[PDB]
Design a protein around this ligand. Sequence first.
Ligand SMILES: Cc1ncc(-c2ccnc(Nc3ccc(S(C)(=O)=O)cc3)n2)n1C(C)C
Lengths: 262, 294
Amino acid sequence: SVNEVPDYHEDIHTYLREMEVKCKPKVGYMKKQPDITNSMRAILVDWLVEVGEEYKLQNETLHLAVNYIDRFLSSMSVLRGKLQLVGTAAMLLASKFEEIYPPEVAEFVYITDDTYTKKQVLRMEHLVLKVLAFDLAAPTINQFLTQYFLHQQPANCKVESLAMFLGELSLIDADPYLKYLPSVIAAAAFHLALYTVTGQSWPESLVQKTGYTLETLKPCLLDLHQTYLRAPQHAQQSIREKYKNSKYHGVSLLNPPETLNV
Amino acid sequence: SMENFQKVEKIGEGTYGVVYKARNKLTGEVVALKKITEGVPSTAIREISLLKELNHPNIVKLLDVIHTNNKLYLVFEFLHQDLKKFMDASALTGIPLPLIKSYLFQLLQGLAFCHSHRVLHRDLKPQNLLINTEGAIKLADFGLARAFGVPVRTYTHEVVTLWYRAPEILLGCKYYSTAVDIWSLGCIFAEMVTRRALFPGDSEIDQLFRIFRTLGTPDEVVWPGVTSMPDYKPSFPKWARQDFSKVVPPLDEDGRSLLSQMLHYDPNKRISAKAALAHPFFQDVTKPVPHLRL
Ligand SMILES: Cc1ncc(-c2ccnc(Nc3ccc(S(C)(=O)=O)cc3)n2)n1C(C)C
């Protein structure tokens, strides 16, 4: 269908592969932040997940906002009392980029419980645009996932939802997931979802599209499997809650496989 | 910042803001400056973020963004006029066919590059297609553009200036894609030949009926799924499809073939910009300068 852009999907994929390397956050940044930690970031991202539920935002919007925050924090030292202001301005920018109907700024002030003023949010918006040099069209896990889903034989809604869920879980933990590119996390999430639901594996057609094999995907895959196995006990639960919904075929209620048999 | 720019004159104006011609005092470069609540508007965020990625000879170049507490200036390479002005200035000459062909070829290159980079333009009217004195034509005003995913996801409905809007938008389809932009360029190709808008409707229903009167009212055979579309009405008059040679009489056989593939009802069958580049209409394409002073 033209909805799958047959004449452009390969150009687009190549382009996104090229951009994900250029838009890549600094793997080591959190060590160099004097005041914030991986756990404060996990809290912010989980809060953004809820904000997205409350305002019925697209998953793509969430992923974009996390990309902005990570890129921002890669050069800008931020105190803990200001982390949520960065995150709010990021979600605002992501909404204006990606949503048909972004929430208004007042709504973004209101969900911080008036921790910050409208003026602070708008000043932060401009700072984030300046630091990112307006480079907002970033590739996400989601953009690779939707292309990978076209290789299913045939389409399985539980596989799709579960792959999204796993991609989303990766956003919460900077360690380990800052070290993996979006295309790779999506590939691991897709393989893992497909295997959990159908018993099948990363297809040969996606080896041809991406150049990735279960061998190149193994490190990410081991990380993701652990994250999946431990998800019920993680301090942050908003993604598990969200993916209970029938919108996502209740996939967070599925049991992870005990082993991968790689 | 602005100390190096000397404004020359106003050239343009819509909701986005205002555009001036200006000059860089140090380099001599002539530019267009576009000067721009809920903070930075989404149209400017989209325009700037998308244009930073799109460097191509048939896409207007964004040179700089000057970002102040108070104001935002976008600095573009200067082009002399829009295609609308040029069509009017060519009133009783017509536009020579080598120029029409060159313009369409360039527009298709610019568009294919947009689509290859996951950007839908969504407002390809002649006012957004800019020409210079060297024979170039370029896509401009990416305020209404969007970065798409593969496959596409529901986006803003009722997009595209009405005369240039594709039937799948007019009929309210849940999804639309790259084919919307090809529909517009098809309308533009016709218009370069006649100097008159092909489908000058005044409402959505009148736009549809004008389309139907020229191309036939579509049915399941020509366009599967059409009778199930959200705004399709089984009461729609049934007009016969009218010989393409009557649609744009001066067009030869190759021209007629390409126009018909750009104005195909089924967005699945409509030609892509990339494939159109190889159409036999362009066998002899060159890049002449425009025949009039700009
Ligand atoms: C909205 C916008 N953003 C940037 C431009 C833009 C960029 C570069 N060059 C020009 N030059 C120009 C435009 C129109 C005319 S006209 C109406 O007098 O024929 C004459 C010169 N414009 N634009 C255009 C589309 C106004």
